[PDB]
Design an enzyme around this catalytic site. Structure first.
Site, PDB file in Angstrom:
ATOM      1  N   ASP C  49      88.985 -51.312  72.672  1.00  0.00           N
ATOM      2  CA  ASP C  49      87.793 -50.490  72.532  1.00  0.00           C
ATOM      3  C   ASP C  49      87.274 -50.101  73.921  1.00  0.00           C
ATOM      4  O   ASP C  49      87.700 -50.667  74.941  1.00  0.00           O
ATOM      5  CB  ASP C  49      86.716 -51.225  71.714  1.00  0.00           C
ATOM      6  CG  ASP C  49      85.664 -50.277  71.127  1.00  0.00           C
ATOM      7  OD1 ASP C  49      85.769 -49.950  69.934  1.00  0.00           O
ATOM      8  OD2 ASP C  49      84.697 -49.891  71.854  1.00  0.00           O
ATOM      9  N   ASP C  76      89.438 -46.702  77.538  1.00  0.00           N
ATOM     10  CA  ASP C  76      88.805 -45.416  77.270  1.00  0.00           C
ATOM     11  C   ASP C  76      89.919 -44.443  76.851  1.00  0.00           C
ATOM     12  O   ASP C  76      90.738 -44.029  77.664  1.00  0.00           O
ATOM     13  CB  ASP C  76      88.043 -44.922  78.525  1.00  0.00           C
ATOM     14  CG  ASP C  76      87.448 -43.526  78.348  1.00  0.00           C
ATOM     15  OD1 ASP C  76      87.677 -42.891  77.296  1.00  0.00           O
ATOM     16  OD2 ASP C  76      86.738 -43.063  79.265  1.00  0.00           O
ATOM     17  N   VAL C  77      89.942 -44.084  75.573  1.00  0.00           N
ATOM     18  CA  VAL C  77      91.054 -43.318  74.996  1.00  0.00           C
ATOM     19  C   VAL C  77      91.101 -41.849  75.418  1.00  0.00           C
ATOM     20  O   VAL C  77      92.081 -41.163  75.170  1.00  0.00           O
ATOM     21  CB  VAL C  77      91.085 -43.436  73.441  1.00  0.00           C
ATOM     22  CG1 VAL C  77      91.137 -44.903  73.023  1.00  0.00           C
ATOM     23  CG2 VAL C  77      89.867 -42.797  72.838  1.00  0.00           C
ATOM     24  N   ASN C 103      92.840 -45.754  65.321  1.00  0.00           N
ATOM     25  CA  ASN C 103      91.555 -45.570  64.631  1.00  0.00           C
ATOM     26  C   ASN C 103      90.560 -44.649  65.286  1.00  0.00           C
ATOM     27  O   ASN C 103      89.730 -44.063  64.596  1.00  0.00           O
ATOM     28  CB  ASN C 103      90.878 -46.903  64.296  1.00  0.00           C
ATOM     29  CG  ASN C 103      91.444 -47.531  63.077  1.00  0.00           C
ATOM     30  OD1 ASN C 103      91.637 -46.864  62.053  1.00  0.00           O
ATOM     31  ND2 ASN C 103      91.734 -48.829  63.158  1.00  0.00           N
ATOM     32  N   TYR C 169      85.310 -31.814  63.889  1.00  0.00           N
ATOM     33  CA  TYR C 169      85.908 -33.025  63.316  1.00  0.00           C
ATOM     34  C   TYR C 169      87.030 -32.642  62.350  1.00  0.00           C
ATOM     35  O   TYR C 169      88.105 -33.240  62.387  1.00  0.00           O
ATOM     36  CB  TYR C 169      84.812 -33.827  62.601  1.00  0.00           C
ATOM     37  CG  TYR C 169      85.161 -35.254  62.188  1.00  0.00           C
ATOM     38  CD1 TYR C 169      85.276 -36.278  63.131  1.00  0.00           C
ATOM     39  CD2 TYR C 169      85.342 -35.588  60.842  1.00  0.00           C
ATOM     40  CE1 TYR C 169      85.587 -37.616  62.731  1.00  0.00           C
ATOM     41  CE2 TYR C 169      85.640 -36.918  60.443  1.00  0.00           C
ATOM     42  CZ  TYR C 169      85.757 -37.914  61.388  1.00  0.00           C
ATOM     43  OH  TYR C 169      86.054 -39.211  60.996  1.00  0.00           O
ATOM     44  N   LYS C 173      90.923 -33.594  62.741  1.00  0.00           N
ATOM     45  CA  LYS C 173      91.551 -34.445  61.717  1.00  0.00           C
ATOM     46  C   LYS C 173      92.744 -33.797  60.982  1.00  0.00           C
ATOM     47  O   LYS C 173      93.777 -34.442  60.787  1.00  0.00           O
ATOM     48  CB  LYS C 173      90.508 -35.007  60.728  1.00  0.00           C
ATOM     49  CG  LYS C 173      89.508 -36.028  61.370  1.00  0.00           C
ATOM     50  CD  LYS C 173      90.209 -37.338  61.822  1.00  0.00           C
ATOM     51  CE  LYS C 173      89.187 -38.493  62.022  1.00  0.00           C
ATOM     52  NZ  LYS C 173      89.878 -39.823  62.369  1.00  0.00           N
ATOM     53  N   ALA C 202      81.396 -39.678  52.529  1.00  0.00           N
ATOM     54  CA  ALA C 202      80.331 -38.933  51.834  1.00  0.00           C
ATOM     55  C   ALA C 202      80.032 -37.663  52.636  1.00  0.00           C
ATOM     56  O   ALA C 202      80.155 -37.668  53.875  1.00  0.00           O
ATOM     57  CB  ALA C 202      79.101 -39.780  51.692  1.00  0.00           C
TER      58      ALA C 202
END
Ligand code: NA
Lengths: 240, 241, 244, 244
Positions: C49, C76-77, C103, C169, C173, C202
């Site tokens: 993380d 740090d990705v 993830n 997003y 994705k 949701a």
């Protein structure tokens, strides 16, 4: 303003001189609305239905518009012999066939637990098997001529949607999408394209007007969709 | 009729009579140029855009030779927000209004992930996906400020769906375009704008698509024949299930 | 009754002996939930993380379960150098890598009409490009050893769904889904399978009348990491939106 | 090397204390292979098929594993009466029903221009209508008890693929997928999840350079039957055509 029901557009000559056969075309509905669109686009039309009186009234209403030829042929799409006679009479009365729009279909509302075999089988027969019958008779005819043609199937968003009490109709309509794909590959040999529209049953805050579905049918019948075969066009569910 | 034979480009049928159509990456002979021609054949006035400044002007002049609608050219590097913003403004200044935007600009590559460079990855994404957002933002801003709506057509790819060795950058970008089409379409309803994409295959008929055939489908999506459609992606033609 | 939140199931040895590396795994989230699942399935785990102190705490909480070994590596990705070092340090600490679970995701809510490039690029970078970075570094590792492995990507229903104010997003994705497909075809050559899970979320409507428990998402990740999914590569498993 | 056929994996206890009913499970093939997997996972099994002798033979072979109880019930899946009695007999012989795997299917190779109604109707009846009959019978049982269960259908990539001469089988398998989605919504009520596996088949083709071993398809069915797929209902899992 997209939420207001839009006015039906003029014809633009998309089908000039083509003979278009449309099923389930008696009375108000997508079938008669599609026959009218085909006439608006310069086509000669043959309409068909099981219901003889309203089919006749629909033919007269279409003829009154004073566009091209309008013929009516009675056809029960659950009968192979009648579907074969539909194609033969179409060619007899109108000289040829260029476009087949397969509308005939039967809905319902029954959960799987309460489903009878009689309803399940009836829905498949009217909604899915009928498309096979008419595609078989049409392709036999197209194999025998050199000019080729186009078929347009009318599926439904229910082919994709998980919906309580719609398993019969959904399965039949998913069936129609698969039949559209597979018969399209076979149809290339005879110079025929086959695609489907898939009407929703909403992004604009309103339902489609019948004419808007017929307008997209006209595209898939027209040379504007020249390269497309075996496709299913959502109208309109933002299908990914 | 024989479907493996390349068909002749069809005549116009008045589908965009009177509309102002802006087409990106439209210098040359490619899909941008072809789509501009289709727009003119359909009665439109047209604005073409590209970064190839001389090639663009030359394309404009050739489209003007048809003696149909007006043809304007506007230079734009689609990797620059300022340039894309200025593309919409100049289109509106020159032609008087914008009715239809066609988002063509894209960038290909062939590189496995294991040896992918950040530079190539970032560039493919910028040209192919982010340019479409730039151009869409700028157009919706224009559309928001006027009372009329209009139509945007994006140009995605079967690579959005297909699993293809060495295409991860372009495939990710084009899948991005499909999702952006969907989400921007829901947002665009407010401004009276419809947004859809065509998705070219790269073969049922045993021949490739003619660029004119892809342009014909773009014209459908720009026209009122597609009146109920928004946030859709039309495969041309991969038998997308 | 399907509308009640179910209790997390026991481990079933689905990953016995495997080294599983999990990103975005500090604190409470699908990352830490996935790391716990890996441990329940018999694995040794490396968690990663951005936030160093939070990561250490999760490392301690996980090692306290008294199951497999738990190591932590800060990454740090958005940094290629740091993602390259994540794989390197993973192999240095745990000896090898068998399973990578990608993830990391960054959410937002902005319409296109009012979209800033800063947010757009950030969302693409964290959500999509990081997955490319990590997959590149893994495959590079697999090319240099006499064994393959498995990657599990974490996409989202938003890849498919038309949703107001989610275009960034959603693009990212959908991008992860296509990357998953293309990278999988290439990974075959290394004996590496690559698939993705696609969780529902949701909009602000669910078949069961409830949200998923994070454990349920991790359990499907476990399946995709395990030999139960032996034939699958390049797939995207909806959990759960009735994806047609 | 992923092109080498992998060895069938051990059970991991995924179906302990469950009764699993599998159709088309006589002889060789996915049904019997699925019944074996159910037993490896700790289930008791009931196998069903039309061929009485071949069914009995299979029953004895699976019983000779010395794992769970194996029962066999003859059923012609084109008969509603026999399908209703399949479920009743299962509950009578085994005590209860927890999982149904709907494997029956029938194909052909016939162009639409040559299609007969009889072959069309036969293919739809065995491949699609049988799944409805079995699902209707099972849901009637589950409605009448206060425990739930799981149904797994087996579709095919042909539901999605444009393929010359397979329009009947393709329509049927596309229909199975839609039936899976809609029955899944209704089944929530009875505590039941319903999903499908979708096996790929070579066009000429496959990512691994090999076809799936039957066990690999059964291993995914086991996942769909297990609590690892806890949140999934109405899903179709591709094994493996890289379904987008
Ligand atoms: Na390259």
């Amino acid at each position: 303003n997209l939420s207001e029901a839009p006015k039906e557009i003029d014809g633009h000559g998309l089908l000039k001189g083509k003979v278009v056969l449309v099923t389930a075309a008696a009375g108000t509905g997508i079938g008669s609305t599609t026959a009218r669109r085909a006439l608006l686009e310069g086509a000669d039309v043959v309409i068909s239905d099981y219901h003889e009186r309203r089919l006749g009234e629909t033919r007269d209403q279409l003829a009154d518009l004073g566009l091209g030829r309008v013929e009516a042929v009675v056809c029960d799409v659950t009968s192979t012999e009648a579907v074969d006679a539909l194609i033969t009479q179409t060619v007899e009365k109108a000289g040829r066939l260029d476009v087949l729009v397969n509308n005939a279909g039967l809905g319902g509302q029954t959960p799987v637990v309460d489903m009878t075999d009689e309803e399940w089988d009836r829905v498949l027969n009217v909604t899915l098997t009928s498309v096979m019958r008419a595609t078989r008779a049409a392709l036999r005819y197209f194999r025998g001529v050199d000019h080729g043609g186009v078929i347009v199937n009318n599926a439904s968003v229910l082919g994709w949607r998980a919906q309580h009490s719609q398993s019969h109709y959904a399965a039949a309509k998913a069936g129609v999408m698969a039949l559209t794909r597979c018969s399209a590959i076979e149809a290339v040999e005879f110079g025929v394209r086959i695609n489907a529209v898939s009407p929703s049953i909403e992004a604009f805050g309103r339902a489609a007007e019948p004419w808007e579905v017929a307008a997209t049918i006209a595209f898939l019948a027209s040379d504007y969709s020249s390269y497309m075969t075996g496709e299913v066009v959502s109208v309109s569910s933002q299908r990914a």
